[PDB]
Design a protein around this nucleic acid. Structure first.
Ligand SMILES: [Mg+2]
Ligand SMILES: [Mg+2]
Ligand SMILES: [Mg+2]
Ligand SMILES: [Mg+2]
Ligand SMILES: [Mg+2]
Ligand SMILES: [Mg+2]
Ligand SMILES: [Mg+2]
Ligand SMILES: [Mg+2]
Ligand SMILES: [Mg+2]
Ligand SMILES: [Mg+2]
Ligand SMILES: [Mg+2]
Ligand SMILES: [Mg+2]
Ligand SMILES: [Mg+2]
Ligand SMILES: [Mg+2]
Ligand SMILES: [Mg+2]
Ligand SMILES: [Mg+2]
Ligand SMILES: [Mg+2]
Ligand SMILES: [Mg+2]
Ligand SMILES: [Mg+2]
Ligand SMILES: [Mg+2]
Ligand SMILES: [Mg+2]
Ligand SMILES: [Mg+2]
Ligand SMILES: [Mg+2]
Ligand SMILES: [Mg+2]
Ligand SMILES: [Mg+2]
Ligand SMILES: [Mg+2]
Ligand SMILES: [Mg+2]
Ligand SMILES: [Mg+2]
Ligand SMILES: [Mg+2]
Ligand SMILES: [Mg+2]
Ligand SMILES: [Mg+2]
Ligand SMILES: [Mg+2]
Ligand SMILES: [Mg+2]
Ligand SMILES: [Mg+2]
Ligand SMILES: [Mg+2]
Ligand SMILES: [Mg+2]
Ligand SMILES: [Mg+2]
Ligand SMILES: [Mg+2]
Ligand SMILES: [Mg+2]
Ligand SMILES: [Mg+2]
Ligand SMILES: [Mg+2]
Ligand SMILES: [Mg+2]
Ligand SMILES: [Mg+2]
Ligand SMILES: [Mg+2]
Ligand SMILES: [Mg+2]
Ligand SMILES: [Mg+2]
Ligand SMILES: [Mg+2]
Ligand SMILES: [Mg+2]
Lengths: 60, 134, 259, 178, 143
RNA sequence: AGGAUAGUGGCCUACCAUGGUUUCAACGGGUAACGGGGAAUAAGGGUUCGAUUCCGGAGAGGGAGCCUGAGAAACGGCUACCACAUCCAAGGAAGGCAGCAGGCGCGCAAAUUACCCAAUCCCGACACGGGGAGGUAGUGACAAUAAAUAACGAUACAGGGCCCUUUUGGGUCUUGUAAUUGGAAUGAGUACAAUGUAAAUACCUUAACGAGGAACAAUUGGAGGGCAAGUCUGGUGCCAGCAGCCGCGGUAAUUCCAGCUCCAAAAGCGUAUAUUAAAGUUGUUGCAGUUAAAAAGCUCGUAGUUGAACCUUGGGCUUGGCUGG
C-alpha cells in the first residue's frame, strides 16, 4: 500500500485534553475487608428496582 | 514467672565417647529463653556432674515462646570432654582459645606461592637476591 | 570413564540405608570388601543413622580409631567398611554383639544377639573347586576362603564358620525342606522352607518358598540363603518378626491393636 | 548437587473468568466465612476436586477389593477425623456429596466465631492473626488451620493473651501508665 | 469399511498415513519446517531489539481513515528491516532516529492486526525505558 | 593361516571366494537431536517437551599423537600442527575458566572477583592436612507455601425484626448509613539480650519502642459484545487515537483522551512468543470426500493389508472353597 503521511499531528488529542486532578478521596479497604464490603452491597442491602439490578447506575 | 523446668528424653549412655547424650526440653514461661551457660549450670546441679563436662547446643524456641528444645552431652570427666568435643564448642564454653590464622585467601595464595620454589626458602631467596645485582 | 568411581551421590545410594534427601549432596561410598556395594551396610550408617551413637561423620571416625569396633572378631577402623549379611559387629565397650540379618521390610534389622551366638557365623557356599597343589576350597558369600572343607559340601550349601579360626563346624546340604531367608528381590527378608526347586539349564533356577503362614512366593536361586535344617530350626537367632510378610491391611490391624 | 525439594500448587482457577453465577456464589460464600480473597475458595475447590477423583477410581473397583477397602477407609477415616464427614455417613458415596461449606466449617476462623470467643467472623481472623488464640498449649495464628475433632474442645484464648489472663497489651499500658 | 485399514497388523499403514497427513496442518508444517527459525524476522524469538531508521506513518485500511504512526527498525540480531507500530496517543514523539527499541509481536502470531497493513510488530521500549512509563510520566527518557 | 590386542572379532595382513543391506524403507539428507529417569496438559485415547539436582555417554579452542600408571589417548599432563593470543633487553620464553567468582562479546534472555571445611562426603603415609566437591551468606517477584493492609464498640439516624398494641403512639432487637465518637488488639520496622552459626545474617523467642487520614495510604487491567462492570461529565470531531475478533471516532462518543463511579484478580496483574486442552480442525477410539476442500479417465497388477465353514459336544458320577438365608 501507499504509505506516507504528515507526522505533525502526533499526540493531538492527549496534548489538548484539559488536565483534571484526582480528588483526594478516602482510601479503599484492602484484603479481607474489601470482600466484606462487596458481600453486603450485593446480598444484604439489595438496591434492586423491582427486578432491575444495576451495579453502576448512572444518575438518571 | 521463672520456674525453669528441664526434661531429658532419648537419653543414650555412650561409653564409646565416654559421655551421656540426650535431648533437652526447657520450659521457661514468662521468660524469653534460657542461655546455654545457664542451662549448663542447672544441668550440672541436677545430675551432680562437673559444669565443664556438660555441653548444650542446637536450641530452638517453639512458636509462642515458653519452650525450647536442644541437644546435650555429659562426659564422665572434663578430660574426656576435652578429647571428644569439636573445637568450636570448647571455645563457646571457654575451655579453649580460638586459633588465629590468616584468611583462606591468604593461606591459599601462600601455598601456591611456595609451589614455585624447589628446595629451601633460604636457598631460593639467596639465589633470587644474587640475580638482582641492583 | 578413565577409572573407578570414588563418590556416591545421595540419591544413588542403596535405598535400604534409608538416608534423607536434604542432608547433603553425597552418601558414603562403601569400600571394597567382603560384600558387594549394593548389598552392604557401611559402618558410618550403622553407628550414626541406626544406633545414633554418633551425631555426625566426625564422631564415627573417633569411635573406630579407639579400636572399639570389631567385625567378625577383628578390629576394623575403616568408616566405610562394607559390612553385610551374617557379619558380626562387636562393641565390647558397650558389651553388645549384633548380626546383620534382613528384616521382613527389606532393610538391615538392628538384631542384637547373645555373646554365645556371636562366636560363629553362616556363609553361603558360592563355589567349590581345586586350588594350586590340588587343594579344594570353599568361597562363602562374604569372600572368605576356607581350605579343606568336608568333601560332601557343594555349591548353594550353607557352612557354619567358627569365626575365630575360620574353619567349618558343620554344614547344611541344599535340599527340599530347608529353612531359607531370601537375600534379594522384592521378597527380601521373608523366611520359609523350600517347597520345589525348578531347574532351567542355561538360565536362572527358581525356588518356591512357603511362608510360615502357607504363603507361597518364587525367587531366584541367587537370592536363596539356607539358614536351617528344617522348619522352626534356624541356626542363628532371627530378627523380630521371624521373616513373615504381612499385608498392609494386616499391618494396620496389628498396629491398631498394639496402640 | 543436593536433591531437589518437592513443591506443588494448592489451587486452580476457573476456566471461564466472568460468570455471574459463579462470581455471586463465590462472593456470597466468601462473605459468609470472612475470606480474604477468591483464592481461598479456589483452594478448597481444588482439594475437593481431587478428593472426588480419588473416590471415583475406587468406586470403579469391585467391592471388597484390597485397594478400595484400605485406601477408601483411610480417606473416610481422615475426613471423619477433621469433622468434615459425619459419623453416620462413612460409605464413600456421601464423600462425593461433600460441599465446600463442609470444609469451611472446620477452619480455625469458623470455630473461633462459632465458639463465642469473637463477635463476628471477621473478628475471628484478626484474633487469630494477632496471636490471641491457642489450640492446646500451642499458639496458632493460621486462619485456615483445620480443627480436628479431638482438638475442637481445646480452642480458647492463649494463656499469655490479654483476653486469656495475660498482661495488658501495648495500648493499655501506654494509657494507664500516665 | 470407513475407507481406512482396520486389520490388527496394519499399524504401519496407519502410522505412516497419519504422519503423511499431518503435513496438511499448517501449524504442524511451521513447527517441523522451522519456518519461524528460517523465515520469521525475529528468528522465532518473542522479542528483538533494533535501531529506528525513520518515522513515517501508515494509512489505515477501509472503512477507517487514520495515520497509524510507525517506525522503520533494523534488527540488531540479523540486520533485517521491519515496520513497528508505536502504540498510544503521541508516543511517536518519544521515539527518535537512531534509538535502540525493543520490539514484540502484535499478538496475532505473524499476521497483521486491524486496519494496519503489513505491520506485525509493536514498540515496547525505547532507549531501555518502557514506552508505557514514558506515556504515564513514570520515567523520563535518558538522553 | 598369521600379526596385533588384556582379550573375541576384517581389528589388521597374506592368500582365496562373491558375498552383505534394502519398499517390513536400506543407503542418503535434515535435526533450531546427547539418551533415559522424567516435565506440561490431561474423561478416555493422546499432543508437546526433557541443555538443566539422578544414571549412562561425550569434550575440555579445533584435530592428531603419546608419557606415567591398575586405570587416561587425561588436557587445572605432555608433544606437534591450525586459529587466537602474552612477556621480550629481539637473543628467547610461556598459553587454554564447557571448574568457582569475575570481565568482554553475544543477545529478549540469567547473580558476589564474599566466608568456611562446622555439616555431607572424598583424597593422602593420615584420629591431626587438603578439598570454590560441598555448605553459608549476597543478588534474586524463575516457580511454590502460608498469609497483613484492619477489628470491635458507643451514640446518632433509617429501615426492617419483634413485642404494648387495632393502625395512630410507642417499647424494643437484627441489619445499613454516619467529616461522628471512643477505648482496646497486633506485627511490618527496630532494639537490648538469648537462641541460631565455624563466625555471622536471617528465622523462632523476647525487655523498651513501634497505628486514626491508623500518609504503615494495593496494584494491574478493564466497563458495547465475546466478558463482569456506565448510554454519566468534560475534551476531540474519520483527526488524535482505540480495537486479539466483531467494530468505535464526521459536535449529548456506552469503545478515543481524562474526571467520577463501577467490574475482575490481588502481592500480584498485564503484554510478546512457544506449547497443551478447547480440536471429533489429524479423527485407532473419532473427521470429511454429489454440490462447502477432497474418488486416480479406466482396467490389470507386485509388495502391503485382509481373507467362507468344519475335527470332544453332550451326559453321568463324586467333588472342595466360597457366597443367600
Ligand atoms: Mg613448601
Ligand atoms: Mg616448597
Ligand atoms: Mg571381598
Ligand atoms: Mg570379613
Ligand atoms: Mg456480579
Ligand atoms: Mg513436504
Ligand atoms: Mg501442533
Ligand atoms: Mg474489516
Ligand atoms: Mg531497548
Ligand atoms: Mg585369526
Ligand atoms: Mg584378537
Ligand atoms: Mg546439538
Ligand atoms: Mg529431545
Ligand atoms: Mg532429563
Ligand atoms: Mg536430559
Ligand atoms: Mg543446545
Ligand atoms: Mg551427569
Ligand atoms: Mg575425556
Ligand atoms: Mg571456550
Ligand atoms: Mg587431550
Ligand atoms: Mg581448566
Ligand atoms: Mg580434568
Ligand atoms: Mg567461571
Ligand atoms: Mg531472569
Ligand atoms: Mg555479575
Ligand atoms: Mg540453608
Ligand atoms: Mg500496604
Ligand atoms: Mg526487624
Ligand atoms: Mg532485628
Ligand atoms: Mg553467638
Ligand atoms: Mg485503574
Ligand atoms: Mg455485560
Ligand atoms: Mg462531550
Ligand atoms: Mg472475538
Ligand atoms: Mg461534545
Ligand atoms: Mg461525549
Ligand atoms: Mg451502558
Ligand atoms: Mg471497549
Ligand atoms: Mg473512560
Ligand atoms: Mg475481587
Ligand atoms: Mg483430549
Ligand atoms: Mg472439520
Ligand atoms: Mg470434515
Ligand atoms: Mg465435512
Ligand atoms: Mg474436517
Ligand atoms: Mg464450486
Ligand atoms: Mg471416477
Ligand atoms: Mg476361519
Amino acid at each position: 500500500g501507499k504509505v506516507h503521511g504528515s507526522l505533525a499531528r502526533a499526540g493531538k488529542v492527549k496534548s489538548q485534553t484539559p488536565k483534571v486532578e484526582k480528588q483526594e478521596k478516602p482510601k479503599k479497604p484492602q484484603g479481607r475487608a474489601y470482600m466484606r464490603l462487596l458481600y453486603t452491597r450485593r446480598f444484604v442491602n439489595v438496591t434492586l428496582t423491582n427486578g432491575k439490578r444495576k451495579m453502576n447506575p448512572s444518575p438518571a | 514467672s521463672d520456674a525453669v523446668t528441664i526434661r531429658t528424653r532419648k537419653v543414650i549412655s555412650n561409653p564409646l565417647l565416654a559421655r551421656r547424650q540426650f535431648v533437652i526440653d526447657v520450659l521457661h514461661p514468662n521468660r524469653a529463653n534460657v542461655s546455654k551457660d545457664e542451662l549448663r549450670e542447672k544441668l550440672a546441679e541436677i545430675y551432680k556432674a562437673e559444669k565443664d563436662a556438660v555441653s548444650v547446643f542446637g536450641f530452638r524456641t517453639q512458636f509462642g515462646g515458653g519452650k525450647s528444645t536442644g541437644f546435650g552431652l555429659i562426659y564422665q570427666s572434663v578430660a574426656d570432654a576435652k578429647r571428644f568435643e569439636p573445637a568450636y564448642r570448647l571455645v563457646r564454653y571457654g575451655l579453649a582459645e580460638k586459633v588465629e590464622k590468616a584468611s583462606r585467601q591468604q593461606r591459599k595464595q601462600k601455598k601456591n606461592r611456595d609451589k614455585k620454589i624447589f628446595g629451601t626458602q633460604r636457598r631460593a631467596q639467596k639465589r633470587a637476591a644474587r640475580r638482582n645485582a641492583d | 570413564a578413565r577409572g573407578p568411581k570414588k563418590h556416591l551421590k545421595r540419591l544413588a545410594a542403596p535405598s535400604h540405608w534409608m538416608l534423607d534427601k536434604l542432608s547433603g549432596t553425597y552418601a558414603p561410598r562403601p569400600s571394597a570388601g567382603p560384600h558387594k556395594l549394593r548389598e552392604s551396610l557401611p559402618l558410618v550408617v550403622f553407628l550414626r543413622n541406626r544406633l545414633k551413637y554418633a551425631l555426625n561423620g566426625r564422631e564415627v571416625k573417633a569411635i573406630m580409631m579407639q579400636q572399639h569396633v570389631q567385625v567378625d572378631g577383628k578390629v576394623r577402623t575403616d568408616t566405610t567398611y562394607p559390612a553385610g549379611f551374617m557379619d558380626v559387629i562387636t562393641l565390647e565397650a558397650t558389651n553388645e554383639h549384633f548380626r546383620l540379618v534382613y528384616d521382613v521390610k527389606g532393610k538391615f534389622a538392628v538384631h542384637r544377639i547373645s555373646a554365645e551366638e556371636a562366636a560363629y557365623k553362616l556363609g553361603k557356599v558360592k563355589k567349590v573347586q581345586l586350588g594350586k597343589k590340588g587343594v579344594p576350597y570353599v568361597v562363602t558369600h562374604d569372600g572368605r576362603t576356607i581350605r579343606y572343607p568336608d568333601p560332601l559340601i557343594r555349591a548353594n550349601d550353607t557352612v557354619k564358620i567358627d569365626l575365630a579360626t575360620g574353619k567349618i563346624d558343620d554344614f547344611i546340604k541344599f535340599d527340599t525342606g530347608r529353612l531359607v531367608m531370601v537375600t534379594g528381590g522384592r521378597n527380601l527378608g521373608r523366611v520359609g522352607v523350600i517347597v520345589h526347586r525348578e531347574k532351567h539349564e542355561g538360565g536362572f533356577d527358581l525356588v518356591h518358598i512357603k511362608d510360615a503362614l502357607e504363603n507361597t512366593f518364587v525367587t531366584r536361586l541367587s537370592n536363596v540363603f539356607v539358614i536351617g535344617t528344617e522348619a522352626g530350626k534356624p541356626w542363628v537367632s532371627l530378627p523380630k518378626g521371624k521373616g513373615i510378610k504381612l499385608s498392609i491391611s494386616e499391618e494396620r490391624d496389628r498396629r491398631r491393636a498394639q496402640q | 548437587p543436593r536433591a531437589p525439594r518437592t513443591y506443588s500448587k494448592t489451587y486452580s482457577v476457573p476456566k471461564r473468568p466472568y460468570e455471574s453465577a459463579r462470581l455471586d456464589a463465590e462472593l456470597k460464600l466468601a462473605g459468609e466465612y470472612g475470606l480474604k480473597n477468591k483464592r481461598e475458595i479456589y483452594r478448597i475447590g481444588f482439594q475437593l476436586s481431587k478428593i472426588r477423583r480419588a473416590a471415583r477410581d475406587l468406586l470403579t473397583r469391585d467391592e471388597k477389593d484390597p485397594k478400595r477397602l484400605f485406601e477408601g477407609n483411610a480417606l473416610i477415616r481422615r475426613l471423619v477425623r477433621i469433622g468434615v464427614l459425619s459419623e453416620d455417613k462413612m460409605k464413600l458415596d456421601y464423600v462425593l456429596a461433600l460441599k465446600p461449606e463442609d470444609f469451611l466449617e472446620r477452619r480455625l476462623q469458623t470455630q473461633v466465631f462459632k465458639l463465642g470467643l469473637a463477635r463476628s467472623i471477621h473478628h475471628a481472623r484478626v484474633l487469630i492473626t494477632q496471636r490471641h488464640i491457642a489450640v492446646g498449649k500451642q499458639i496458632v495464628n493460621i486462619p485456615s488451620f483445620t480443627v480436628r475433632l479431638d482438638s475442637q474442645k481445646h480452642i480458647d484464648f492463649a494463656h499469655n493473651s490479654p483476653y486469656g489472663g495475660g498482661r495488658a497489651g501495648r495500648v493499655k499500658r501506654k494509657n494507664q501508665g500516665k | 469399511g470407513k475407507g481406512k485399514p482396520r486389520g490388527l497388523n496394519s499399524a504401519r499403514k496407519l502410522r505412516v498415513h497419519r504422519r503423511n497427513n499431518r503435513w496438511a496442518d499448517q501449524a504442524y508444517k511451521a513447527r517441523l519446517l522451522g519456518t519461524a527459525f528460517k523465515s520469521s524476522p525475529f528468528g522465532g524469538s518473542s522479542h528483538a531489539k533494533g535501531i529506528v531508521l525513520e518515522k513515517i506513518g501508515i494509512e489505515s485500511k477501509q472503512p477507517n481513515s487514520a495515520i497509524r504512526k510507525c517506525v522503520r527498525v533494523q534488527l540488531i540480531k540479523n540486520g533485517k528491516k521491519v515496520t513497528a507500530f508505536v502504540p498510544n496517543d503521541g508516543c511517536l514523539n518519544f521515539v527518535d532516529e537512531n534509538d535502540e527499541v525493543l520490539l514484540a509481536g502484535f499478538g496475532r502470531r505473524g499476521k497483521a492486526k486491524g486496519d494496519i497493513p503489513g505491520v506485525r510488530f509493536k514498540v515496547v521500549k525505547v532507549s531501555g525505558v518502557s514506552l508505557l512509563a514514558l506515556w504515564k510520566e513514570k520515567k523520563e527518557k535518558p538522553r
